[PDB]
Amino acid sequence: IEETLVTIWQDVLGIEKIGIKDNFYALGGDSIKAIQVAARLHSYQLKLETKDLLKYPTIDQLVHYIKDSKRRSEQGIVEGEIGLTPIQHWFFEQQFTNMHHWNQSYMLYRPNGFDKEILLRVFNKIVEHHDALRMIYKHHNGKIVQINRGLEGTLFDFYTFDLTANDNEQQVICEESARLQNSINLEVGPLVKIALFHTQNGDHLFMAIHHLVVDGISWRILFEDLATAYEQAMHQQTIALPEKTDSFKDWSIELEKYANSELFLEEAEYWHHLNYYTDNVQIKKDYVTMNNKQKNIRYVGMELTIEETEKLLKNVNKAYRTEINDILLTALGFALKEWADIDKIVINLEGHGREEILEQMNIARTVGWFTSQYPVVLDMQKSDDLSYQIKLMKENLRRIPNKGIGYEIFKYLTTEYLRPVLPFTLKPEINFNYLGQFDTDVKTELFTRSPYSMGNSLGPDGKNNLGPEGESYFVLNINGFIEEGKLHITFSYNEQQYKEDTIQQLSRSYKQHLLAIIEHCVQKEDTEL
Numbered sequence: 001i002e003e004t005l006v007t008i009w010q011d012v013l014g015i016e017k018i019g020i021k022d023n024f025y026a027l028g029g030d031s032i033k034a035i036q037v038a039a040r041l042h043s044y045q046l047k048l049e050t051k052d053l054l055k056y057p058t059i060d061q062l063v064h065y066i067k068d069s070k071r072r073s074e075q076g077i078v079e080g081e082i083g084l085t086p087i088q089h090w091f092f093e094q095q096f097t098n099m100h101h102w103n104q105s106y107m108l109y110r111p112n113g114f115d116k117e118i119l120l121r122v123f124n125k126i127v128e129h130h131d132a133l134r135m136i137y138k139h140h141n142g143k144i145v146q147i148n149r150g151l152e153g154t155l156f157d158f159y160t161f162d163l164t165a166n167d168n169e170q171q172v173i174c175e176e177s178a179r180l181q182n183s184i185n186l187e188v189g190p191l192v193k194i195a196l197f198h199t200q201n202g203d204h205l206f207m208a209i210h211h212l213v214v215d216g217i218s219w220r221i222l223f224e225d226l227a228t229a230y231e232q233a234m235h236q237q238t239i240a241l242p243e244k245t246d247s248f249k250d251w252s253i254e255l256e257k258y259a260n261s262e263l264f265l266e267e268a269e270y271w272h273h274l275n276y277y278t279d280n281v282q283i284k285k286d287y288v289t290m291n292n293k294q295k296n297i298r299y300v301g302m303e304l305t306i307e308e309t310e311k312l313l314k315n316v317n318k319a320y321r322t323e324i325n326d327i328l329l330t331a332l333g334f335a336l337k338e339w340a341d342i343d344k345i346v347i348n349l350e351g352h353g354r355e356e357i358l359e360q361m362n363i364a365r366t367v368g369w370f371t372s373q374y375p376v377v378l379d380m381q382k383s384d385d386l387s388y389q390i391k392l393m394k395e396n397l398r399r400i401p402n403k404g405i406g407y408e409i410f411k412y413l414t415t416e417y418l419r420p421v422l423p424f425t426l427k428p429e430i431n432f433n434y435l436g437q438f439d440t441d442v443k444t445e446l447f448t449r450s451p452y453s454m455g456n457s458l459g460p461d462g463k464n465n466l467g468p469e470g471e472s473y474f475v476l477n478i479n480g481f482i483e484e485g486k487l488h489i490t491f492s493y494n495e496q497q498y499k500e501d502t503i504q505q506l507s508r509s510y511k512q513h514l515l516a517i518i519e520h521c522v523q524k525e526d527t528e529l
């Protein structure tokens with residue numbers, strides 16, 4: 001029904017009232033919000049191909065393209081060996097020092113406090129429902145063996161700290177959470193570490209999960225099921241989570257099939273264009289250094305106001321019928337041109353990686369590490385013409401098949417005798433990672449973000465996420481997100497490679513060009529057919 005879409009859109013977009021004529025993207029939608037709509041529909045046994053939502057961005061149009069779900073996923077307990085996925089292959093290939101310490105984290109806050117007994121019940125359901133959290137990793141014969149445990153052993157560690165007497169809540173939270181962050185055992189588990197802090201202003205719920213089994217969308221899913229199960233428990237109802245989508249196991253199995261399929265191999269030809277840019281990869285550094293560890297990384301931050309961010313989310317993409325990636329990367333092109341006099345450069349672009357490339361596979365609600373990464377070429381031709389550059393960036397991104405998911409599939413999954421001959425040793429020095437919007441997911445009726453949280457806990461600059469002795473792998477690590485209605489962009493660099501001021505010039509330049517692109521696009525009316 002259209003009443004179901006209205007409700008879902010309203011929840012997902014964080015907008016109280018939505019008409020059946022409202023444009024999804026003009027309301028602030030993106031491809032991650034789209035997946036969240038698809039996930040909600042799955043619980044109603046309804047199917048949405050997110051690409052339809054792009055062609056029919058209103059409920060009045062889209063209702064005719066919503067189908068019944070033919071796919072039924074594993075609802076029981078998933079167990080057994082699972083082949084590493086592309087981003088997982090990349091991870092082990094790095095051989096990070098203390099790779100057991102390589103996590104994402106988050107901290108929630110509830111002024112009236114959490115009931116601990118309920119939390120224990122809720123997280124038991126969580127690790128049961130979201131099978132990938134029970135993963136372990138073993139070595140057998142110089143090879144990594146990924147194994148999904150059943151309901152055996154310890155599925156998560158949970159600590160309770162009573163700081164209601166301590167006068168230094170922030171220090172203790174940092175010290176204790178750091179200990180959790182450093183205590184993950186990849187061989188026997190658990191990969192999920194949880195601490196509950198009682199304080200004078202309420203409770204703070206800290207969570208650290210090894211990156212091997214989680215990502216940005218997974219966190220959003222966890223937050224939802226956390227609130228849902230908790231709300232049920234405090235109302236003395238049976239804890240009950242939405243239907244499972246496809247398991248990480250089943251996904252990996254089909255992904256490896258795809259990797260060697262005839263249809264996918266035909267894509268190899270496109271990626272040859274990278275061969276024209278192999279010497280457009282390195283940027284100038286202030287200094288040469290041998291010290292390349294996480295402890296040597298610092299960052300510069302920028303942010304827009306709520307008004308500026310609203311324009312970006314709601315009134316910019318209409319100008320050229322773009323998506324936010326087009327805009328952000330166009331701004332980066334200009335910024336790098338003014339900052340280092342660069343005309344062409346190859347970057348590493350991260351995507352959520354949940355592309356409908358596998359048939360009736362649905363992972364809209366699956367917890368795991370699905371992140372894709374791939375080389376993108378930025379080409380600065382006409383610095384004076386915005387219309388030309390934006391349309392150039394747009395076309396460049398559209399010429400990439402299936403959001404670039406295929407490149408690392410070729411690189412890590414395709415068997416040797418089918419593996420195309422591609423420039424696999426290409427290594428961009430710049431990474432771009434825009435995580436998307438989080439306000440609707442973290443700011444609920446049950447809880448909100450913790451004030452004791454330090455920095456972006458879902459990124460590499462998050463406090464205590466990565467082991468300090470671990471090796472850095474990018475010269476410039478650019479990460480972004482929307483928090484409290486404000487776009488944040490951070491620039492992570494090696495302190496012995498660049499002076500802080502050098503990076504500050506890049507950040508300010510990026511902010512300048514981004515705001516200029518916003519003003520340009522705000523003034524351009526929708527005329528794409």
Ligand SMILES: *O=P([O])([O])O[C]C([C])([C])[C]([O])C(=O)[N][C][C]C(=O)[N][C][C][S]
Nearest residue numbers: 030031032215216351352371434435436
């Ligand atoms: O295809 P889209 O919906 O347009 O992509 C959504 C974006 C704009 C947020 C895109 O930048 C993206 O996919 N970012 C994903 C980065 C990520 O998921 N990181 C996970 C933790 S490593």
